Amino acid sequence: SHMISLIAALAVDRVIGMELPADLAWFKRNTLNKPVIMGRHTWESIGRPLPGRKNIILSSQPGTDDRVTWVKSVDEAIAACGDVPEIMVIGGGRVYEQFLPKAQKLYLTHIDAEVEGDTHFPDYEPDDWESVFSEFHDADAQNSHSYCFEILERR
Numbered sequence: 484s485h486m487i488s489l490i491a492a493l494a495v496d497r498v499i500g501m502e503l504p505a506d507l508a509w510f511k512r513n514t515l516n517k518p519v520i521m522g523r524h525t526w527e528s529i530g531r532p533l534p535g536r537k538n539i540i541l542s543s544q545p546g547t548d549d550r551v552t553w554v555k556s557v558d559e560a561i562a563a564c565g566d567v568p569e570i571m572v573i574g575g576g577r578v579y580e581q582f583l584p585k586a587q588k589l590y591l592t593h594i595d596a597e598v599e600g601d602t603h604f605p606d607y608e609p610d611d612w613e614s615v616f617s618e619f620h621d622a623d624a625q626n627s628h629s630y631c632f633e634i635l636e637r638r
């Protein structure tokens with residue numbers, strides 16, 4: 484039904500960034516075999532296509548890599564995903580803002596960490612978002628901060 488979802492990691496103040504193992508497993512299991520959409524910035528920091536996913540890059544500037552699909556438009560990106568149940572929007576503060584109005588599902592990782600930056604996740608007023616899932620984790624040997632997975636559905 485071409486549900487668009489957003490998956491993000493947030494620190495306090497909704498601060499986001501590009502460059503915690505458990506969050507990588509969570510990210511990987513919720514995007515596996517789903518087409519993913521991202522900004523230049525986000526593409527540039529991974530370097531590799533994400534395996535077994537249609538990688539789609541949203542940018543005004545022209546393409547530099549044939550392994551991934553390039554688009555200049557929110558609607559060009561959605562159409563490039565084709566007939567799939569769920570589209571995963573994975574990154575760009577700017578890309579998250581462009582796709583929140585078209586999204587029904589949110590996959591958030593709340594990390595108990597201070598981070599200095601002005602890249603913030605978009606305000607999602609609680610009025611029309613319902614929280615359906617919630618999972619806290621202490622810090623352990625592999626994960627340096629406590630963190631909490633959350634999934635919200637649009638009311």
Ligand SMILES: CC[C@H]1N=C(N)N=C(N)N1c1ccc(Cl)cc1
Nearest residue numbers: 490491492501510525573574592
């Ligand atoms: C640790 C971040 C990772 N984790 C979740 N849960 N969601 C994301 N959006 N992540 C992500 C962030 C930036 C880039 Cl470039 C790629 C992936």
